[model samples]
Target chain A: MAIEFNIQESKILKGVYIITPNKFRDLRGEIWTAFTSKAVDKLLPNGLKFIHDKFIHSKHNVIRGIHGDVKTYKLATCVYGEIHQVVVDCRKDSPTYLKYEKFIINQDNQQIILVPAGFGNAHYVTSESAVYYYKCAYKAPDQFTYAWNDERIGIDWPTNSPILSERDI
Target chain B: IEFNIQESKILKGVYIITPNKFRDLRGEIWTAFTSKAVDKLLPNGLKFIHDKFIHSKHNVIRGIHGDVKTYKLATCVYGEIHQVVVDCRKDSPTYLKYEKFIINQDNQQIILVPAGFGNAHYVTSESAVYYYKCAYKGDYVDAPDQFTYAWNDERIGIDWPTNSPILSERDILATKNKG
Candidate 1:
């Protein structure tokens, strides 16, 4: 069967999306697409140009981000293993600001999140290891961070204490 | 080179591009292809509409296939592959010429196959993931529209390392008839 990428609007936040990418399987294993420009370009805020593509491999119980910025549009997913992905609408001026949503992304599901500039994104590795992929427009931004467990944006994280970087600490 | 990829020419019209893989405590990330780093290798700018991954079993052989309308950029995403590219442009000086390279996860080198060049790869490891970015001139055409010669065709002789290699139905016939 031929599968195509599908996009869904986020119920918890505005300008957030859940995308299912094309995956072809046969006797020779499978080909899971991380992202395809044709499937996403039309819905993008700016034009169709994702200048940067990056991947971050995180170990189990490790948490990264709760970080958002004023620049760049991002489409992210876990290409290997599993993770609990969270996107918080931290854009202060928006009506649904501070509202958060959680998604379970893994190689099996292969879901991608299309995040606008004002959304804070983070993920917790649920498996032994996971490779998180990012395709975005623009360079790294001067991002702002939110406490992973802040009461205001109560993220029911898998772990009480998550592995963090100095910036998150 | 934000993706930290580099390139070098190997054959008359074939090139090899390698990504600077990054590894740390968390594991590693192989940035296999970046159009920005590779477009200059071709006279026309790069715009790939399709990306494919062929995960094959051990002792398998794929390709020695080509089409005049598509430019294929290929690489091994996992395990090792003995990659061979044969230039099939009849009038070109490098006609029927071939080059060999070993691509694996660690190196993650991308190979460019200009139009009119056929590619054949043997799985050197237990299993392999063949990843490629493809571009077309007009509308896209698949297997039926392309040409494939015998994987063991004598005229385009290649000293493939593995003997007794497994092949698909089409490739099996390519050996019997296309030769």
Candidate 2:
């Protein structure tokens, strides 16, 4: 009666997690699960209440972020197509500060990444298009964007030039 | 930008909608239930607040039930399904007349099942993902105005592909009782 999933913490950054929900397969195909409310409770910070849901649809070579707000926690995943997701540690004093981790999320390979408030997030779509969905804590806007091309981090991205918004530019 | 949509009224108050799925150079995004899109298709005050997803295997036949106060926007997000919607309202011209829809991920079609219509489906693919965005006027507990009909009821002659299907105890019971 219970659906299960596996969780592994990213060695590159503290508090960043990669979760894989169990896919129950049968002759009929597979019953793929994302997450249940109970599993989310354990995955999120103690008593942290997520308030809203949002989605971003991007095309190939469209890169978003390298932004962080220490006050907000984000759970992100891809529902359609594929994307190269990168999470950068923005906590100035942490040992892993400026250290980044990369993840590939696609429709078939369902990976839900939980980024703690102290990190910035970015994604590069390698597929024709991809939809990124997330739920997060609200009531805060003190977020900052880390430079995508900052030499200090030297983040590895497949594409040098990508579509970006004015805020990200 | 406003999206494009095509609505076909297959039955009284039942609409088979072709949502103008957003397609860009990168990929496509399908908005299953957005207030801006679905609200206009429904009554002035009715709105969808709950979403239920059921992922089943091939030969899985689920639901032969009808709701009196709830409106369901049903669609298949993955694989394929043969969906059925029957008008069960009393004193209606189209009462008991059923319509079927075959949809898959490629088609991106949605069925709006209004009150007094029984909704059901048979998963024809290896497996499928089905979701219903439900809206009703009330405090919303299961809304006791629901009627559960048997899959093999003598009154309603539905031509299912298989007589022996994978079902729940309740659905199997309905077949045994022949209601």
Candidate 3:
């Protein structure tokens, strides 16, 4: 059965989609159909196929990426725990250029964000740990990153002193 | 990085395994547990010592049985099945409360039955290929850590998919004796 997904476009960024997954819960547990072929078809404007699926098992206070490539797109969600994600529009001519939007993606909310090409994205772990899963249009190379704590970006991050890697620094 | 890892309705110690599947025209590739990924996510540690698979015919049911200290992660790899787990921990608020799930290859979701829970399932399709990962290596006979419960006990009151089911001699006897 094709599960129905509620798809919404982000008001801040054009071509950025948010999908609310269908969840069925009973006393034993809950099951979520995060993405099915039909659901993905509804979300993609140009019927782009995702060739790669990747996941990040990040620890508490760890942050990863505001990184993107010129010809890659991502559909991301937090399958376990919670994460505060910031997506910065990098399209120079775009109305929301260099502007960032914050979203709390978690198991409870079951929200997924679509990051198209030319957008830099980063996420911070707000709870004990988080599992972030994303699908890529293809293998992205020549990825660029923006500092998570850059004063100019001014992301209202949940924590000030979060753990960072040498690359992030 | 400041991300929220909060789970408002968390099931303590129970892990949900949604193995990554890479599919092609030939077939697919998926793994139940990745040591590097799962170990970092779980605190108590998930050391899988044994793996077992069951090929059950239609309407077949496997108990309300469990080992004393063994934790189990179960998934249906082929057909559909109605799986159930009941918390047997005496002090648990959800003790004796059972939950049901429909598992099949399409969804590929695994349910983790922790140490203090009794787990069982019934084949809903023509047949079901069920697989599980166990924390302990002992058999149910020699070591006999098994705890049995009546599969159709009135008190348990499971909204079973069917009124008639084909059961084993052991399960028949267990239910007859209301174990």
Candidate 4:
């Protein structure tokens, strides 16, 4: 499910699909929602395929990103907590190559961005616990890994000390 | 170019190119930003060129629109702000959609939202300011190609905390189900 950014019209980048539940109430405390893949798929584009979903639990200032895959394109969304999603246009041919944008999404908003394969992306956990989901068109390990603090990219990571497993460090 | 002002939305390939820095005894400064060279273009299968960029005044709420012609994606730069997006495309499987986010220079974040939604945004800062880009460039004021759902519709009740939003007559009265 793609969306319009503003009044401008550009198609090179497809927008995101937000899957939020509808609630009806009179006496209830405030019914919210639950996720249904079928409902989500209806609003999303056909190319979106869910390969695997993961969650991240980080303390304040934990910056993780500037990572991407060359083979598979990805779309990411936050389901529970919040993350500062960042992307850098690494596509060699793109006019904005090396350009970057950042985002902060949480469970309150059920939305995700469709990221191209050549872009570098990362997130800084803003909540006590963060759960995020990513969809990929294809899969490969070589496609996704980068130093969160690569100076060449120079990302302003949020944390004083980021918690990383040995495999991640 | 995609300009979805949907709060908490993320669009890939979005970039904030800060100027290179120079250090000196006087102070540290930056130089040579390449905003002009970087195309503020959004590709919606084709391409929509954005020439004019406008800034919403402090405390102004301007979005919640789905282009009648194309979808939108967006970001918040400079000051603090809140973005709201609603999925109004009944045809889309994800109907009655809604989301919100607080975007600002602190995070340097942007959002991407597809067509068929209404956006209701507000400046969180006392002097919140923003830069917006889009995919379609045309006189679309009256064009039915743009999709607008009510921003305050109950079904899409976005749990937006109070920020003294500046809303238009249309937005204050707009309902989610009454498109």
**Which candidate achieves the best lDDT against the true structure?**
1
- Scored against the true structure, residue A19 in model 3 reaches a CA lDDT of 81
Each prediction's DockQ? 0.28, 0.15, 0.02, 0.02
**Global lDDT scores for all candidate models:** 0.73, 0.72, 0.68, 0.48
By lDDT rank, best first, the candidates go 1, 2, 3, 4
What pairs collide in candidate 1?
Answer: none
State model 4's lDDT.
0.48
- Pairing residues by index, what is the TM-score of model 2? 0.58
lDDT of 3 by residue, A63-152 (tens): 877788778888888765689988888888988887888899865687888888889878888877665667667443447777888776
Q: In order, what fnat does every candidate score?
A: 0.33, 0.15, 0.00, 0.00
Which ten-residue region of model 2 chain A has the weakest summed lDDT?
A24-33
**Clashing residue pair totals per candidate (backbone < 3 A):** 0, 5, 11, 63
For candidate 2, write residues B1-179 as lDDT tens digits.
Answer: 23345554556788776655665544445555455656677788766654445667677887798878888888886568888888898888877878888888567677888888898988888666776666677752566777988877767778887888777634443333444
Where does candidate 3 stray beyond 4 Å?
A139-142, A166-169, B1-179
| Candidate 2 CA-lDDT value | 0.72
Ranking the candidates on TM-score from highest down gives 1, 2, 3, 4
In model 4, what is the error at residue B27, expressed in angstroms?
42
TM-score of chain B of each: 0.83, 0.83, 0.78, 0.59
Error of 3 at B117 (Å): 26
Which candidate, 2 or 3, has the higher DockQ? 2
